[PDB]
Amino acid sequence: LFFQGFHNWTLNPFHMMGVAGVLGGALLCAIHGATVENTLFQDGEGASTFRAFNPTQAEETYSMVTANRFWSQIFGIAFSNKRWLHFFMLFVPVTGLWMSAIGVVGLALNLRSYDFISQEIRAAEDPEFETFYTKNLLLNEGIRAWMAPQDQPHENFVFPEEVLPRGNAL
Amino acid sequence: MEVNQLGLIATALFVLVPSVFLIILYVQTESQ
């Protein structure tokens, strides 16, 4: 929450790449596990299918061929190469955490993606121009002022009631 | 909106240069 209100971290493309790689990693995690479990070959005779696998078998325990058709027809495209598939699973989340890191190196220096100048020049001149970007900066300003005195006590911030940004009523 | 007009050439080359690179490699692959 510090990082939202002081750095506007959600707006930083390096974090956005990171979000994509973590949520895409989880997607790859789930969709690959679910695909394997639902393209298994029948290699035993019970309803617990976990026993039909010998780690020394030569054979693929599921059907790449049927998996590929399923996903080509459901989603338009599919993996066909098992090696690229598990390499891509490494790449996606590993690449996303790296992008996020770069953005934090930026923030070590307060080198933030905090503003869009073009929005602020319009906003400052046109009191009817409002976007989700300006609404979020107003939140950010709330976080800074309401949380700083106690969050950075060594600063001896004293904010009289009357300076504390607040909307109506609240 | 008072945007940076260097942003247009920046965006344009950001796309064109690396995309050109890939296209060149792919076509020369398809012909051998």
């Binding site: 590929n68 080509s72 495209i77 066909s80 | 945007v3 247009l8 965006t11 344009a12 796309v15």
Partner: peptide
């Protein structure tokens, strides 16, 4: 010009989708 630029990139991606699906490398069983 910025609006046009965002829409153009978006349109290129939708065309990419088309070719990626319908003109993919067909997977074959070798």
């Amino acid at each position: 010009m910025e609006t046009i630029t965002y829409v153009f990139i978006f349109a290129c991606i939708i065309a990419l989708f088309f070719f990626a699906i319908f003109f993919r490398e067909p997977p074959r069983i070798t």
